[PDB]
Symmetry: D2
Subunit: 307 residues, 4 copies
Amino acid sequence: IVTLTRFVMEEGRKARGTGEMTQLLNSLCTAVKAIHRAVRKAKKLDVLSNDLVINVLKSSFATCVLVSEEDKNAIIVEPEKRGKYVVCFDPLDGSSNIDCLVSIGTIFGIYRKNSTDEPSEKDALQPGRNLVAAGYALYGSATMLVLAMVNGVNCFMYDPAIGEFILVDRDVKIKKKGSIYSINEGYAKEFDPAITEYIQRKKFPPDNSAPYGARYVGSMVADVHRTLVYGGIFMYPANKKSPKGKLRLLYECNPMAYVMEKAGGLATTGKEAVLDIVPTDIHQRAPIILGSPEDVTELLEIYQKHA
Amino acid sequence: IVTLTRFVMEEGRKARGTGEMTQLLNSLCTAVKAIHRAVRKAKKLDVLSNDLVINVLKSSFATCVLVSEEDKNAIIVEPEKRGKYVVCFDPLDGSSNIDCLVSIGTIFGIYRKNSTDEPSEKDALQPGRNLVAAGYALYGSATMLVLAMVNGVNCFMYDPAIGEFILVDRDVKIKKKGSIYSINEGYAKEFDPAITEYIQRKKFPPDNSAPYGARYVGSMVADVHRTLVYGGIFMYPANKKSPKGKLRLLYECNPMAYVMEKAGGLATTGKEAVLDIVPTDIHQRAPIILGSPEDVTELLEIYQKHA
Amino acid sequence: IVTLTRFVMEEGRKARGTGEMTQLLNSLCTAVKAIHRAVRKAKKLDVLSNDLVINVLKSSFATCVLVSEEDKNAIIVEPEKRGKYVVCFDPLDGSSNIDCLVSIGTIFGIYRKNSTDEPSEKDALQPGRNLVAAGYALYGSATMLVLAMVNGVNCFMYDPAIGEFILVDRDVKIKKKGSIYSINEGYAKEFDPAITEYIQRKKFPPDNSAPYGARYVGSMVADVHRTLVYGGIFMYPANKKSPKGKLRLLYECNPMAYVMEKAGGLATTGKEAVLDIVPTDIHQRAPIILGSPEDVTELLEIYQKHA
Amino acid sequence: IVTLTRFVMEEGRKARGTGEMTQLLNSLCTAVKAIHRAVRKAKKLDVLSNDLVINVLKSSFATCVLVSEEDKNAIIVEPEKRGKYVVCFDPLDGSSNIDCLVSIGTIFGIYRKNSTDEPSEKDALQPGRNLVAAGYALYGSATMLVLAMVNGVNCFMYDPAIGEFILVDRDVKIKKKGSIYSINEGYAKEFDPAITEYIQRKKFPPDNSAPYGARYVGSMVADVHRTLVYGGIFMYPANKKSPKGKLRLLYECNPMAYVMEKAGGLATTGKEAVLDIVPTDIHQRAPIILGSPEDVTELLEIYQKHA
Ligand SMILES: O=P(O)(O)OC[C@H]1O[C@@](CO)(OP(=O)(O)O)[C@@H](O)[C@@H]1O
Ligand SMILES: O=P(O)(O)OC[C@H]1O[C@@](CO)(OP(=O)(O)O)[C@@H](O)[C@@H]1O
Ligand SMILES: O=P(O)(O)OC[C@H]1O[C@@](CO)(OP(=O)(O)O)[C@@H](O)[C@@H]1O
Ligand SMILES: O=P(O)(O)OC[C@H]1O[C@@](CO)(OP(=O)(O)O)[C@@H](O)[C@@H]1O
Ligand SMILES: [Mg+2]
Ligand SMILES: [Mg+2]
Ligand SMILES: [Mg+2]
Ligand SMILES: [Mg+2]
């Protein structure tokens, strides 16, 4: 009934909209499709996707700065194709899961260039709550674009048949409480006491209750998605070893914090809202705790308690 | 260069082969393709796939009894289409992961009907080491058929482009030791002491070493595959609560035990080789511990030790 | 390297462009894709395609009036989705060729609504040289969008793989003279003397020469395309029996006259340029003679001569 | 409901069947699929397809000699992969129609090697009525395999979705009389008097009647198919200039004569049944007149009359 094309544009009418967004979302989708295709019949793959997003974004004529998980230095579009947009992406998230055919995907966040000053990285270093829009594409089982703007969150399923994305749920809102905790527990020797105490509670309900089911796919987007659609909680915390956890703020953490918050979720470092943290590096990491609010809250209480 | 079609047939030449197998593998693949297709643009889905495997298998003219995770009672093909083969399948494995687009798949095992007696369930109740061939199809990221016969293990990638499966690795052999433990740890309050003691060791290496990474996707085939191609260990043990664990022997446990053993892996209940257990029910469960031999061994030592 | 998306938009930048076009071409393409898909695995089909073009065009928000070969009465979009554009289409051209899997396609022409008056058919009744843009999609062998605006003519090939159209030739220009005449000769008893005399010349070169090859596929777009890319001439003339020939002016004749003229071709009724004829009916027919200029000219000379 | 796979095999059961056929039809189909794919997103293409048919046929292990329109000399499979079958194919028929996206296809005929003598061309030089089976694949609009064995004629539609061919009509039988004559009339100066007199009758019905519609797509298979499913007549006769017409007997003429005869059609040189002509060259041409019997008969009467 409704393509992402129709949908985006119908939002642009809504906002007397720049629609510079539209071109941009449009190029983006072209990419996602290109990736879905490379992936579905396949670290070059890591690399292939990068270029694609970089190229399509350039030609969108709607972006000025690009931040890629896969690139040392931020990219500024040569002037002719310049756009008022700044885009940070994890081109395909889940290196580890590439070779064993586990779900992988693309995460992206869009900021409006606020700077009058010629576009520079500094343009990328804004807090997550400046995002104009954020989303991800998940290539597993099926492809799914999850787009989230100020309005709320909307899921579109890719139909390889007609080469379009198609609204399935819009908008989405996450269960207030869930049954699934997602964290890499090998790092158990390293976890702060709040996490630890927290994990135990999930395995040994004090109020006798069922213990949470545990899932960790290994791909952020896969885990973040399951989280979004099923409810529950997802964790990549700091350990003694990585002070700021492992997941980067620009292309991994904020988009998902955003998606999560717009869905009525929550996303904290354990000490603060992820969106509200203003970065000092285009490549900085940040502990992330997201998902059903009731659940994230429960853990925040531990953190508060332990300090 | 080589389709599964060419490949199977080139094995049939090898064995002066019945090739009743060929028709059967062939119908099977037709199915996998049908499923890949339903899944990639989608519990009816659970149900849809069932029929497909049931129908294509019937029309193969090479099977007599069918055991399906999804059916209360075993199926015996009406006589005209009868075949000397008995096939047990989990039509799509990972109900829980269906809706959130995590990798799912099909597991299957093929036994030759030994019984002179008219085909009955009893035909299905053989030990895993009577399997003629066993395999699975994994719909995530990409599709992949993993076929394993007496010869060894071979991976074919589905190419949606020409509608064929195509050899990528053949045969496969698993790393002797790995870095990844896969188990649902919510059930931690229930785990026997050997598991427990075992999990700790992975998180707190006594020989100071890196602690294993942990992954649990939620789908058996997804986990079993990652295990196969990356090395490591996968666990669904009995707890106090489920005496014989959760995974069924016919369609989930044995195929994977087989795939695993033919790949040079290992697969124990913790007390015995999974293949070597002769079932009393077409729907019985069985604790399963598989993957890199060195790893499974390490845990077997715990089990032995604790008894 | 270049999608139709990128391309269209890069023209819109060029013209400070309305880009209301872009949305429109975009919806159009969505359709073509939908049709390609229905067709490639298939008079309902005639009917299915109609709706698709009608719906996608409505939702484009860029059209006011629609003229369809398949509809008795012109369609005016309900006001909210109104656009400054008027679109006439043969939704799929070649009814006769549907069932026997011969190439079929979609022909379309876009006019800017000039009328201040509320949109009415009269909005459709303009001469072909008022077209803003015209084109067709050809579903045979491969899919191909041929888009032609004031600039010139450009061919994009559909890639079912990523669900995009991709520039292959742009712009196109037709050979000045060709080797192939295309006309349904069963109607030979009916042809005016100029056609007749003309056909003979092709079969019996007076300047001893090779006689033209003859092709008539049965689908206008198929024939018009072969004509465009190979050179030669295509004919659907009036006979005694159909005074104004068989092909309709709005959705069949003008788009192709346009495509042809922008490619440096020619398109006459035999008495006048097809574009320059101002219609009195949204469903009127008109004799059409198009293709390589040298060839069309040769026949015009006959016509002049015989009058 | 029914794949070509199931169907072929269900014929092999029927005939206690060699099923060496099955492997062969199976490899064949693999090819057709490969070609459909190359074609649908594209003289290399002429050449690409050749190899594919050559390779897949070799690996079928069911053919000894191959005759290809595209190869000067007949091919004999290196001994290990030898089969009792001889296959003559036009790998893709309609060179002229390749670049302008008009329907193209593959024509093939299968003979059982009768010769005790080591396989040599002489193995290919049999009359058309020795064909074991004959068919074609048509890539236009949609893909369609038309398989015809002693039983009768059956049409399978390729479904790019699951990568299978699927029965749509089986068997087929052609209308006794039709409304469409198909011939390249540029060659009109060359046509024998019987053709000429014949063509006129179609344009000027003596019994006042409608004159036949005329279609000539340019691709043999396209024309032959339209003919088969719609009825009518198709002609590539000898002229003064080409004594034996243009179409080759092994890979173009006989398969279609066969398909046509098994469908209840007719196929004559004008002087004799095409099947009944025993060739002296793997690359020889032969005038062909096929299609609805009543129609072909009408023309045979002319031929008889004029001699
Ligand atoms: O290996 P662990 O510690 O689980 O880290 C996994 C995380 O890293 C990410 C981020 O990049 O993938 P990967 O490192 O494999 O590229 C996420 O997809 C995932 O959530
Ligand atoms: O929910 P938990 O206890 O992890 O059980 C998951 C296991 O069950 C299986 C077996 O059926 O899936 P599911 O129950 O979701 O159908 C496996 O795919 C998976 O390994
Ligand atoms: O049947 P004839 O007289 O050849 O008319 C064919 C013409 O009609 C058209 C126009 O609609 O197709 P059809 O009538 O089969 O729908 C053109 O595609 C084609 O050029
Ligand atoms: O060019 P004309 O004389 O029509 O010959 C066309 C015939 O030749 C064939 C046979 O090869 O195609 P082509 O020559 O273009 O390769 C047939 O498909 C078609 O029927
Ligand atoms: Mg990443
Ligand atoms: Mg299951
Ligand atoms: Mg039409
Ligand atoms: Mg040919």
